[PDB]
Amino acid sequence: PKIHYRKDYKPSGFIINQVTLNINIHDQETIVRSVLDMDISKHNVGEDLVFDGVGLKINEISINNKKLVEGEEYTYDNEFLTIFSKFVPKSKFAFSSEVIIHPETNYALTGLYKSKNIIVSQCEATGFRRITFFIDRPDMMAKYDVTVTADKEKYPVLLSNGDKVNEFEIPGGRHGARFNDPPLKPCYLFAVVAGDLKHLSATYITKYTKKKVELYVFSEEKYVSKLQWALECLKKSMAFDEDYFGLEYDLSRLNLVAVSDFNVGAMENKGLNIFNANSLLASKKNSIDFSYARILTVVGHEYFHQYTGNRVTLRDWFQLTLKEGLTVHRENLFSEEMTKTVTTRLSHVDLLRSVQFLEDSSPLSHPIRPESYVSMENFYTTTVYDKGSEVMRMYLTILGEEYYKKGFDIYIKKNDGNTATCEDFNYAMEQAYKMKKADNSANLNQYLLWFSQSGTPHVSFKYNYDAEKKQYSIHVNQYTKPDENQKEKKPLFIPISVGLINPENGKEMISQTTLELTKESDTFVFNNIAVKPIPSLFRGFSAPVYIEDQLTDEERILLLKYDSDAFVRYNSCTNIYMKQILMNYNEFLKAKNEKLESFQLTPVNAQFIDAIKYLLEDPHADAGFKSYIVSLPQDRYIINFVSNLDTDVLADTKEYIYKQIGDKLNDVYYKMFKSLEAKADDLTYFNDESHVDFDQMNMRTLRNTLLSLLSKAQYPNILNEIIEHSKSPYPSNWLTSLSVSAYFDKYFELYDKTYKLSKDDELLLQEWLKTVSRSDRKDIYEILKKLENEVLKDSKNPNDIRAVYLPFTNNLRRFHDISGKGYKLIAEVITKTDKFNPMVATQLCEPFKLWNKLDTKRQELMLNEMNTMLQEPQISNNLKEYLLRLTNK
């Protein structure tokens, strides 16, 4: 198994200048003819010409129109085509080939494949070599001239990159289109689509050059009424890059295309972005609320790649975070501006500190720029994406908006049209840093450690106040735990956005201040501080770290009520909950271990409960924020703080704490549930797809959160509310009615009702599957068996399989059944999936990522299933590599 090392990068001995393709789609096969106009590079040392080419059937290959013969002049082993150097020309030459591929049976969804009745490609990272021979690496930039031919009735719409320059008829009911794309690009940005596509379109006029851009959004005919919001999002994305970054789209046309079968969310192929239908299509009757932020995020993300990834591309795959971390950061800026809700940033943080922090303390921990890989398909991680985003966001925090924008533009202007590395970005940022500091000696060399050092830093605090001196000090320490990547961890450049709150009136005591912690510890002193403050630390979550605020719960409550920063308010709440969780967890654990007949539990802080009530009852407070404060921290966040976590004991702990709070606040919850109804469920704009109200969707989130709390609580006659909720036109509401009815005898009545509402829309049915999967049912295993037999069957659609199984894996009490039966079930699904889609099989391993954090019995049970999966004779490269790393072999 070949290991690629970052330090081993070297330019190719060859150059590919022009790609001319003919892709002829037929019923049982697709024939790909390719002529590569090539040259010898300055780095060439007379080596064999080796092309990537995976699973290609060779019809013929030639050099300069002379047919090559197998054995004598080349070898092919289904992975590499080797042309022996004595047969490789010493100057410019043409290499040509004709191969046969089979998209109909390509269930791995990489390369060229068939998704229902649409032919579609996915080439990132190294999928182009599944279509034709190539030196398949992103520094091999070339011009593309692409002809696609197909049956006209089945495939009337033909798309590839660049301008459509010809369309023609072919005998026998066939037709062709030629696409010429003169600007250089890496092969992972090649795409082709063929199908009976329907569309919406619009014309966008750019801000400065006033170029007309044609925008097209495509789907299968059945779902063409779900395209409107995507088109609106694309317009919004274009405006935001213009307005914030001064960047205009450079091409005549941009196509977005939804397909049903897709391994991830979407892909930024130049001028031809291809989407998982679940991240492009929605309508108010047939989509839950989360679809709208999703589509906004994913359309924006792919659009922002046109600069950060497409126009400035990657030297090599170890630079992945340079385009993905930066594009997630650009998408987050965009979505924060579009939604105007604080819950947008909080949701990002919530995901990072649960999913990505778990990854970074697991055996899979890696820096955002890894030193090696075996599988590229395993490289696309929350570390590279989401910690990468936070590392890209810290530059903005450090520089401020004006100098950040200046540094970003330096980056774009210097590297436009070229490959680039992480150093190129740090360099641009450093030039702005020198400007901001008015100091040509300032540098960001330490900052590069964010790219190379793995693990989550821990930042802790001590405080001191001298009332006579009016002098306040914040002593700060950072620590990263050693791991398999670095034995000795170095201090990072950590920006700490801080405020100082006057506890008597809740007001700010200093101006905006970002502490630059660059040592293992430092002491920051403030003069003329008139009263002892409560510090507001890491405002906006200003670094991707574990924060240990060393505040009392009284101080945390004061911040929760009166601080100006949404994240510190949310974090102060989080920290109050975590202190309670850890305390009750240990009390339950001791009672379990000692077999106690009687014991005591520490009650929830009553002033905390009063504070929650205070915020809930404040009309001027934000509904999305309110839904967070009544929610305990994510299980995957909690597990980072507990060794040998007994999931039953954690389930008992959560249940006690929710019951404590509900016993005081349920009447408040119910009153709000009823009073929110009019605004939350307003139907005024239900048949307008252009009109999206993120505050209103947050009101529904709050209403559905409260209803869940009230249902679990068996609040008197709440089932009446549940039944009425099932009649709401909004899927977020009527699917919520199904999941909260789990606690009542009406569950299967609502199961059938909502199934009937869901079954005729592909994406809605997947949302219904998730709702069932996540239902808090004692008979959930029997229910999953019913989904398998009656709905899922042998679907190879990743959306179907992920919907049925992933939500269930978050069922703390049942997935982690001490028998190991949940582990056994997901491992069977992983092995089954691995036969046809290794990338999705590795996604389905997600619940095993925390295996060594659980109690000893469940560690053993998980490890047994992983070892069983590893012993499968037909295990894929992807899955084997992943499980070997996860189990520390």
Ligand SMILES: O=C(N[C@@H](C(=O)NO)c1ccc(-c2cc(F)c(F)c(F)c2)cc1)C1CCCCC1
């Ligand atoms: O879809 C996602 N990411 C893709 C991306 O960055 N789009 O711009 C993404 C695209 C392609 C791949 C990918 C797909 C493959 F089939 C494959 F083999 C591969 F190696 C990578 C992984 C992630 C996300 C994370 C960004 C927002 C949507 C969910």
Ligand SMILES: [Mg+2]
């Ligand atoms: Mg093949």
Ligand SMILES: [Mg+2]
């Ligand atoms: Mg404008």
Ligand SMILES: [Mg+2]
């Ligand atoms: Mg289907």
Ligand SMILES: [Zn+2]
């Ligand atoms: Zn991306």
